[PDB]
Ligand binder design. Sequence first.
Ligand SMILES: Cc1ncnc2c1c(I)cn2[C@@H]1O[C@H](COP(=O)(O)OP(=O)(O)OP(=O)(O)O)[C@@H](O)[C@@H]1F
Ligand SMILES: [Mg+2]
Ligand SMILES: [Mg+2]
Ligand SMILES: [Mg+2]
Lengths: 929, 73, 132, 117
Amino acid sequence: SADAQSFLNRVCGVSAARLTPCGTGTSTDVVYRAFDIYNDKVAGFAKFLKTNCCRFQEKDEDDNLIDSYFVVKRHTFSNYQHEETIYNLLKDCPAVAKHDFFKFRIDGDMVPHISRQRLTKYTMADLVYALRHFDEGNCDTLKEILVTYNCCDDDYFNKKDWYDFVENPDILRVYANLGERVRQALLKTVQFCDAMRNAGIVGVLTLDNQDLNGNWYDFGDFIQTTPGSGVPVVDSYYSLLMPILTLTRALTAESHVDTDLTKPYIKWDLLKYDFTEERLKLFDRYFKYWDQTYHPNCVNCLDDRCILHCANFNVLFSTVFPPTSFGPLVRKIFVDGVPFVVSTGYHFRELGVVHNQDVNLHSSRLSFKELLVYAADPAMHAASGNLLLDKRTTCFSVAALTNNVAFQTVKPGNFNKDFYDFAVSKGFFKEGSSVELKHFFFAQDGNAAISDYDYYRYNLPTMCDIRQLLFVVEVVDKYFDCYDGGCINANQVIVNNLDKSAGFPFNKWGKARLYYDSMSYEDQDALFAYTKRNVIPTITQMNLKYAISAKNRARTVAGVSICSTMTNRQFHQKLLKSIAATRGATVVIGTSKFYGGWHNMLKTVYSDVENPHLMGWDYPKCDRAMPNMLRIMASLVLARKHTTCCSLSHRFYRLANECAQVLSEMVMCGGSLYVKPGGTSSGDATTAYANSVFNICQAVTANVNALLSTDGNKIADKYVRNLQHRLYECLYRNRDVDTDFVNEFYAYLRKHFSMMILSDDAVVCFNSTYASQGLVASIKNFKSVLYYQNNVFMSEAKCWTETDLTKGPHEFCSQHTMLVKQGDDYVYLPYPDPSRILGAGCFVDDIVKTDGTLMIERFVSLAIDAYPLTKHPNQEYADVFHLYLQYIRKLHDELTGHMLDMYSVMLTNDNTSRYWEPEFYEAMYTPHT
Amino acid sequence: SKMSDVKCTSVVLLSVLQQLRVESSSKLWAQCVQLHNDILLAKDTTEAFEKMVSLLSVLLSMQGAVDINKLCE
Amino acid sequence: EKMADQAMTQMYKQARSEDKRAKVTSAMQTMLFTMLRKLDNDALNNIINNARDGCVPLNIIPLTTAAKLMVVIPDYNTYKNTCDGTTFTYASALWEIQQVVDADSKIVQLSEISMDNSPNLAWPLIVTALRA
Amino acid sequence: RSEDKRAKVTSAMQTMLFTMLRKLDNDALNNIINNARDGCVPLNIIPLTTAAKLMVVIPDYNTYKNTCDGTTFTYASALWEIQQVVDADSKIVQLSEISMDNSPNLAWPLIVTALRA
RNA sequence: CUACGCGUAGCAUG
RNA sequence: UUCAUGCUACGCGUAG
Ligand SMILES: Cc1ncnc2c1c(I)cn2[C@@H]1O[C@H](COP(=O)(O)OP(=O)(O)OP(=O)(O)O)[C@@H](O)[C@@H]1F
Ligand SMILES: [Mg+2]
Ligand SMILES: [Mg+2]
Ligand SMILES: [Mg+2]
């Protein structure tokens, strides 16, 4: 056709470029670019059809195809005059892709074209969408982006698990090759925002109008004002691009001299801690027109939402500053002449520079409170201890406290032979039988403790999307409104297990009983008020756990020091004992599975969901790879109860105490301190509850992403269309908490995505018609949000979907379920994996519980946990409970025989007649008690 | 089974080796737990028995530890 | 009668705890070789009987198609039991001999091993071999 | 009985703090305290610049050639001379029996110990 | 006779 | 050899 070859000539124009007609000679329907729009038809960040573009493609010398396209928009002349009016006022800025405006007779009409110059194949929103709505099968746009910008060759993608972060952590390097591309795009955004400020034009800046070279193009939705007074609305832009700024590490070039990637690293002054001036310099370079007040040090913050806001920027900005700057801040104080060096500060990567304020220079005496604060401090231990260069980990070591490195080995399990003989005599473990020992005590070598410490390399700096996090923190706190929390005084703290180890260095002198009994209540209250005014850093003696597993991986327990537990208990135990005693909520920590409790759990999840399926998931490396932002977000949600008992600076120093004692912390892994890049200590007070708030945050973020991933044109319902529209309003356009809409979205997710969370493992009961349309979260939305926020890949294998409600959760808390009958009522019974129960019987951690006849209450508790197997259709499973029943029979037989052979016959025999009778084990699941 | 009692035999074998202070040699104990943790994660029988042969030989290299002359009867 | 019940059961618990703690080593080794004789594998009973009459390996028995295995041979009747020519029947796989080192650490050849040289040989024999 | 337990743990904490103050250097540490423009110094730079000695735990021979080569190596912009090399069994390893050939015979990891020169 | 708190032990879950 | 939850088993205090 002459028309297409003449149009291909005219779009070239002044700038000479050989072109190939990508698409067809008319306007080209694109293959699903992602957009960020808000107008009166749709709202959200979804994939749409760009139908008005006429995309071309440049040809260089010797006819190669380049990453340089001419997006040619056909739009109306009433927009075209406005387009040229704005572009003639942004023409000198180098962050505007050129535009080449004309009109041309496609059908004899002089239809106006916007024949833009040298845009990439994709826009920033395609990159943000592909890395953010990541689907393991459908990721062709992410592959084209990583290939065309030399981040990895195309044969990188034939690798097994190329996309995963847990396996193949070279994908972090592959993504980081986009880091200068993203940073150059941020500089172009600031050039564009400066130029559109100085031209005085007003409009929202969306990701989709920015290519990968940086150059902004689209000049509709702009209104002209007086020059010097214009403002660009970059809340949706920077908010939606925030997970990519640490996924691709766009500020590693800021850690070079002159910020040039060829030049060496900045030799920072190794004593310089207070990077506040450079933090403000970074924020004025990159996030310039981000019009909410950023505080570098988060001590200057105005409420919890401002702490999340400013800590989100410090997570990005602290990847530049050297890791020998963070951690505690020590000052050589003097006590009665002899010079201590204790920590009077902390430079958090997130909460800025936090100085103490009850710092005592020239102390004369030290009370017990001050000795705990000074001994729990890593200051002495890293000052007196000698330097360590640990090449075993990538995690930054600091010191070493012994003259040699201690190696920790996990023993094998003391194999109970008597139960295994009784299991093969009663006919188990035959050929091809479906109940075989899959659970063992897997023994470990010497370097297992440090090789399991090193799984904090899965953790990363994660800059969360801050408008999503500042809305889902309100929806998560709407899930926690049924509880009552607050500070309790030292006499109100209930400690259940006093005889547990109190962390380093306090386990060199006794158990936690020693410190709760040595301190008076006034000392504990004064220590808690010290932490109300001062950050104290602590040590977690990260030891190995010796437990049954079905995998050979060692399990570590991060036993925090008692200055963290005895203050986190006073700060948090009212909310924790309220979550552990509120039945029928979303969070089911504390709800017993017995006594018909599992059935009431399941009928609470099933609360009036319209087309109810089920869905579970599991977080790959939840404790190791949880971001810093989501753990401080969970500490804030657990600290939103302190609206009366605390001030606001009290809440910040108690947040910074929790962050310096749990999140980013000096951790002792075998006689040598390391810094921990984040995650959760499992010896934390709020380790099942902040995990639970993290879990609700991932679920609500999956629902927010899923409701904005849908078209909105393609939703036949209009209530959820006008709930999507106010979701994008309350997310990226309103600052404060729109509490009517937070109540509506909470009522929406209690209707259609009803949930159940005992801390890491979750069962929802989602309205499957809406998730077929996308109006709640499927598994693909959890996979995408786990990828861009939690920085792991959650496979489709470890996530299930039980279609019929009547078979219940496939697994919740590693308990399968069934639907069986007692007393003319179909109740739900939770049954474990049968290999787990036989492995617990056959393998004992001590030798004293092998033939010392302590086994009675052991196998009684295993049979209480293994009663619902007897209602299973598989008789092979159902024989497990009778195996334990006859084994308790044989145990009581040999017990009475040996007690007759020793002294005399037993008389109180009817106390044990209930033990080998299933009256005792059925009554543990009848809901009357 | 054969699988079940070779797994339980590897468990009690490494308990015997850890009783005889093979923890003190880091390389020999790393080999012992590699053999043991490959027994217990085994779905085949013959490769479990050949690694059992290897691990029991690591026991039998210690001459003065277990008096095998009097213990077989 | 009532109080003495809990007294005698706590003393019985302490007695059975110390009873299992005391013979923690010898009973575990008898129990190990009990279930080894219960396994009845020919490779396992091969290794147990060779370590019975003295033929004891000096390292780990390998799994590679070719790797090194050091093993003590005490005398010559065991050598007739395990060596037929240039082979070494051991752990139910054929081991190809490559050198023999005697007690004073000299390389001893296969050809001089017979009845007449056996009182002149410095026993034991530290041989080494490769898997077939 | 409780106050005696309180007294013994006060005495033990005071003892370990006073021993670990007389263990830390007071010349390089006082130099970097007085070098600090506000007297406040990050904790994870205190042992990097005022260490009495360095411990490098080396997992394999490749990281041994890359870091602790020879008898004197450089880490943390300072010259460290290898005072000792100890293997994972807490046994001495002299520098001559660490090679590419002997690396399958060493009980890895190796805990080298180096004083500051 | 019954339930509720306390202490110890044990088991399971996260 | 941690934190939090639930349930057993074993001895106490309170009330009906
Ligand atoms: C405080 C605490 N004290 C002791 N144990 C803890 C915790 C916490 I918080 C988690 N756990 C452990 O979690 C295991 C199952 O989860 P699991 O081992 O599979 O975690 P994971 O490795 O990240 O999951 P992947 O296998 O997919 O990688 C299970 O023993 C145990 F619950
Ligand atoms: Mg595990
Ligand atoms: Mg998983
Ligand atoms: Mg797993």
